[PDB]
């Protein structure tokens, strides 16, 4: 029993981090392999920040202006490419602690595990979903970019995020490992507005049936509704339109329970419509949306 | 910026975790040196877990018949021991990837993270706290026993728990890496009742501190207090006395932000006896106390 917002094992992860240094700026890469991915924006300086030209930047730029240190190993930088908003610098040493792993753009809703990490060196594990307007709300530090996010499945390890920058707001934005920006975003400092975060509706209900599983059932109501029903009140609540996908995604929470996803969408119905009156559910006062269908069944089952 | 419940990267602690097996029984052992450390419990029969009498079971056990597996790779035993709640189990090869580590008893309030594992191999990693009840709120599954908690700090791990059991209540109970539990639990299938659980008050304010670095001050008020007014609203609350050492453990969090520690207490006592009308701090609609003032600064500066 007991739910917790729960990381891979960071281990595989940790083993490919290193420190890249070019110039004055200083942040962090991932090595796989015999190639380093980091952020480009490690070329920028003080003043150049505001709108990079990162192809004229990078002009200026040979293989030894890349410092690439792995714990206190220096690695020898042999190739240098720009891919996207992502600089691969091919080193002439494979990672020996290279997992099996390839790279994954994720859908927004789906969620992932962050090793933070500082000067090459790991702080701290997370969990953290990609936000419906391709943010995530992570805990990010300066000297922080470089740091990635990932999913393990047996022992294959699915990179999908590699931190960029914070906005404004205190959310922070980032790419895939072929350098392509979640959402609309751009690597220079300037003004860019989040859209409407909306909240992950079958998440949410992925969660109410990891409640149930444990315990808590006080939610659980007498009434039904259909699709349409519940997404007039998802609509208004600011919740993702739900699909037949996301009914059938639910399929194994929903047999497994005996709760048909309609009664579960019933009674997330009425709690959105009267609240939680000071009770709470899982030890949150909220409701959770950062846990999908399958961090429920890995956690529950 | 952002505030996560973040837990240590779990690498140095997933090269230590073990399989354990007795007769039918199997969970996780740890590791570390010529030494394999797991719950005695592990010698337990169906027909036996009501009141086992260990000593007596374990006199009918022999080094061989303690199977022992670190991942396709079988240990040899070579010796057995018996210290409090745990069994030492004396193998003929030391752990190559054993970490710098120190065992440690911790005091109810502070945090650590848990590598949550089956079979040996590691499923997870969180963050939780010793209640001041000294239980932890984990998320644990049938054969979890075994798994364990600790807190690294430059390369030093230091394990603090030993996951033995699951209360009937759902919440955990189980030992430091010298066999005591952590309360007054006992290893077998009885009627255990956990105590009062108080809200850590000095985690509480170490929150409240890394909302206000982080941009949420909307709870900060015109108002303070004295350590015995807020205590007398603590004790109302079942929020644990605060003291003059909370007070200064939380010096660097005061110092950085100008906010006296006081002055805190009575945005707190606001918090208590009004609750929070609807609005959230930090993503969260409840006071967290599972962040202490280290875990703040660690995390936030
Ligand atoms: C990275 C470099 O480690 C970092 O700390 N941030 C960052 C600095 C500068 C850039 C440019 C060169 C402007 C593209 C991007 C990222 C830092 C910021 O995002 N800072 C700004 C852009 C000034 C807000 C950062 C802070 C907190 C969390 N993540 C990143
Ligand atoms: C361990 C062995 O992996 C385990 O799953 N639990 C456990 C079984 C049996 C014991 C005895 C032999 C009775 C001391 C202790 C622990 C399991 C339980 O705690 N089960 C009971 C005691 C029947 C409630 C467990 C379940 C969930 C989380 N942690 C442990």
Redesign the pocket.
Same mark, same amino acid.
């Given at each position: 029993s007991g739910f917790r917002k729960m990381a891979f094992p960071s281990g595989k992860v940790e083993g490919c981090m290193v420190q890249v240094t070019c110039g004055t700026?200083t942040?962090?890469g991932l090595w796989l392999d015999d190639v380093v991915y980091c952020?480009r924006?490690?070329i920028?300086t003080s003043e150049? @920040?505001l709108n +990079?030209n990162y192809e004229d930047l990078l002009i200026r730029k040979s293989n030894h202006n890349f410092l690439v240190q792995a714990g206190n190993v220096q690695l020898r930088v042999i190739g240098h490419s720009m891919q996207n908003c992502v600089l691969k610098l091919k080193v002439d040493t494979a990672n020996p602690k290279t997992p099996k792993y390839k790279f994954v753009r994720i859908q927004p809703g789906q969620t992932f595990s962050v090793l933070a990490c500082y000067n090459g060196s790991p702080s701290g594990v997370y969990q953290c979903a990609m936000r419906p307007n391709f943010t995530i709300k992570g805990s990010?530090?300066?000297?922080?970019?470089?740091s990635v996010g990932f999913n393990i499945d047996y022992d294959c390890v699915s990179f999908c995020y590699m931190?960029? @920058?914070?906005? +404004?707001t205190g959310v922070?934005a980032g790419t895939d490992l072929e350098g392509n920006f979640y959402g609309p975003f751009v690597?220079?400092?300037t003004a860019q507005a989040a859209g409407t975060d909306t909240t992950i509706t079958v998440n949410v209900l992925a969660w109410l049936y990891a409640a149930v599983i444990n315990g808590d059932r006080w939610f659980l109501n007498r009434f039904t509704t259909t699709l349409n029903d519940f997404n007039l009140v998802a609509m208004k609540y600011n919740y993702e339109p739900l699909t037949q996908d996301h009914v059938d995604i639910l399929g194994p929470l929903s047999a497994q329970t005996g709760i048909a996803v309609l009664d579960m969408c019933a009674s997330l119905k009425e709690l959105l419509q009267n609240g939680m009156n000071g009770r709470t559910i899982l030890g949150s006062a909220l409701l959770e949306d950062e846990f999908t269908p399958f961090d429920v069944v890995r956690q529950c089952s």
């Open positions: 700026t942040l962090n952020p924006h490690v920028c150049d @920040m +990079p990010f530090l300066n000297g922080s970019c470089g931190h960029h @920058m914070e906005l +404004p922070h690597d220079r400092q």
